[model samples]
Target: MLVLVLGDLHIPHRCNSLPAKFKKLLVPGKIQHILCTGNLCTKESYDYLKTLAGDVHIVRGDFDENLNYPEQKVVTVGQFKIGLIHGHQVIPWGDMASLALLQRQFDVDILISGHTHKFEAFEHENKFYINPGSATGAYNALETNIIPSFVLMDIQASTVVTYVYQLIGDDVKVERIEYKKS
Candidate 1:
């Protein structure tokens, strides 16, 4: 299963839309599911995600206008139980200890969160954590230059192959990471 993970798009408030280069690679039919860490901030952005895949899960971000979206969610994909959150509620935003508590509370194998506007993926305490960054390269309290990026995970049984795509200097770069269930 191919799952696309992304978020932190302030939209018309911060930027008009997603970068052209990144949009080109995100056409429909290639992704089986989409997990958005919120910050879409508009219905148009949500519709754009739905066009990419019928199965889309989103959690509320601090900037999200839609109050109906949940603050946290759990989705089961293949052999993994994944938790999604926007991260602002964690206090200190992206603190590993707070995130770990949620991971343990949800009993998830993978935890996904955004709001830092920086891309990060790593294994901590036998659980996988990912932040797909700002797809629109929106500004944050930190970082003068934020590279537009997102993550795609290919899951097969006990292993997950992650592909990180970043747009830097008008070019797109791809990085790969492999993680296995402990």
Candidate 2:
């Protein structure tokens, strides 16, 4: 299964917008699911995700307009139990300790989140944790600048290929990382 993971698109944020080239690259059919770590901040942004893929899972970020989205969500896809959250409520953003606690709380194989607006992916204790960062490159309270990026995960029976994207000047750069379950 192929899933697109992205978030922290604080649209109309400081006048920053999704890169047209990047937006053009994302088509609805290629990915099986879309996982968003919030801060969408508007109905339009949510709708945009709906248009991109049928299985769109989202968790509310601190700045999100909707209060209804659960703080944490778990979805089982194929052989993986995926956990989703927007990490503003967690302290020391992206610290492994807090994320590990969340992993235990959800009992999931993978944990996805966004808050720092920086791309990160790593495996710990037989589980995967990912932060796709700000798809629109929005700033956070911790910093005034961030890279625009997102991630794609290809899940197979024994391995997972994580593809990371980052805006480099006028173009997007792609990198790949892989994990295998022992």
| Residue pairs of candidate 1 with colliding backbone atoms | none
After TM-score superposition, the amount by which residue 86's alpha carbon in candidate 2 deviates from its true location, in angstroms, is: 0.4
Give the whole-model CA lDDT for all candidates, comma-separated: 0.89, 0.84
* lDDT for model 1: 0.89
lDDT of 1 by residue, 95-161 (tens): 8877776655457889899999999999877789899999988889967689999999999999999
Cα deviation of 87 in candidate 1 (Å)? 0.8
Q: How well does model 2 score by local distance difference test?
A: 0.84
Residues 73-174, candidate 2, lDDT per residue (tens digit)?
888776888889888774664788787766554688888889888889999988888999988888888886788899999999968888999988888899
- Candidate No. with top TM-score: 1
lDDT of 2 at 58: 89
Superposition error at 130 for model 1 (Å): 0.3
